[PDB]
Design a protein around this ligand. Structure first.
Ligand code: GW9
Ligand code: GW9
Lengths: 245, 262
């Protein structure tokens, strides 16, 4: 039992490092304390930030779309490193990714957030929570719930080795709509759940019931995703450019 | 064997189970006995259509609205039972009163649908303390938007029931649900987290002892909390539609208060 589980944890960690350029460890060192990020706290600061790194709200949402598309490819590469994933039915792999990416994106974005803002462009920039909140509707309320979630998620003080297994657990969710063969997805998630539990007990022996607390955060996470999707529909309100997004 | 710290967790499990039985008059054990025909004395009358619905009241609105009103007022009575159970959870009544109200406000419906699953199979749901059984098909046939009210609960129930939890398991699970430190507007999160920590420990051990062959049942149970939240979020929205389309339909103030700015 045990050998399999520590091999799985190390493997996922190594893959996670390969696939995700800006890890939580690198990000936390930026948000605490040789180069600080360029801080975007203003309309004017945003203007200069573009010179360094139609209107303001729309241009930021577009940058945000670009970043999303990058992140989905990172996540897809990672998913394919999870033992068993590529041997699943192809439709099912596509379904797991389709419904998993948003959960994964905002989980991992918490690594780049504190209560005051979020790192951008590989940690070269920092956009303040208040600046994003000041954007005119409906853009002003776009990131706020992700910040609220992140504050609660970051209080678990998970590190990259923990998160690598948790993200894999998220990917292997057997309740996604339209799955054809749920059994092996649950079988793999069971194994990943065992590996996460062990990892959190070995890595954080003093955090009582960290495993249970982490799993419970999915409830808030799925809430934020459903709100996000609804807002995206509301926002839908160069052809080749429209196609990519 | 058991050590002193795990012994205390067993005592807590037993206390919660005991309070659960005293608080909730129709248990999963009784519901399953009714449903699976351990019965000559316990057989329900089955409501599957208009004429059988009529006959059921022997043992004035329209059909869809009358059922919904009955469903409403049973909800209220269930909130009462959950509130009396909550008081039994050690530490709960010692919390800030405002936090007691917040925890109930956000937790009571997640508990309602957890326990409703006990009274459901794929074909319908037990009603009136298990004396009746209303079919899923009949409910789904009610006019819009009432016909889609209960379907999400059935879909959740069938998956939840595959975990094969018993009342002793459920008693600790519903306590964990109530003592969530991540509910919005809580004043003092720490004391709540400390209670849940202990409850989570007691649930883990309970599932290990009661279901030793069921791998990661604890994790799989905790994952179902997300389904519950999604039910409650959706259910609320459907209520707002119903209110607006039926200006003559009354919502009980307890329920209206619970959903207010949720
Ligand atoms: C920004 C705008 C729109 C979407 N969307 O269409 O879903 C997503 C985002 C977003 O959050 N992208 C992102 C991903 C990862 C890190 C930062 C930003
Ligand atoms: C039925 C109709 C309306 C509401 N509501 O307004 O919230 C709720 C319900 C309902 O779920 N009733 C119920 C819950 C649990 C067990 C039996 C009946």
């Amino acid at each position: 039992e045990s050998a399999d589980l520590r091999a799985l944890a190390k493997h996922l960690y190594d893959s996670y490092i390969k696939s995700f350029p800006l890890t939580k460890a690198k990000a936390r060192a930026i948000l605490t304390g040789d180069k600080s990020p360029f801080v975007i706290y203003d309309m004017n600061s945003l203007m200069m930030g573009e010179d360094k790194i139609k209107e303001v709200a729309i241009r930021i949402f577009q940058g945000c779309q670009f970043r999303s598309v990058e992140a989905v490819q990172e996540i897809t590469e990672y998913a394919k490193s999870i033992p068993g994933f590529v041997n699943l039915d192809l439709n099912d792999q596509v379904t797991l990714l389709k419904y998993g990416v948003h959960e994964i994106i905002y989980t991992m974005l918490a690594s780049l957030m504190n209560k005051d803002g979020v790192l951008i462009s590989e940690g070269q920039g920092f956009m303040t929570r208040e600046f994003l909140k000041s954007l005119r509707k409906p853009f002003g309320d776009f990131m706020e719930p992700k910040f609220e979630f992140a504050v609660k998620f970051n209080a678990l003080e998970l590190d990259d080795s923990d998160l690598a297994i948790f993200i894999a657990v998220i990917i292997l969710s057997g309740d996604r709509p339209g799955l054809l063969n749920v059994k092996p997805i649950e079988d793999i998630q069971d194994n990943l759940l065992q590996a996460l539990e062990l990892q959190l007990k070995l890595n954080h022996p003093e955090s009582s019931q960290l495993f249970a607390k982490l799993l419970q955060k999915m409830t808030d996470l799925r809430q934020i995703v459903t709100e996000h999707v609804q807002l995206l529909q509301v926002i839908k309100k160069h052809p080749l450019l429209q196609e990519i997004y």
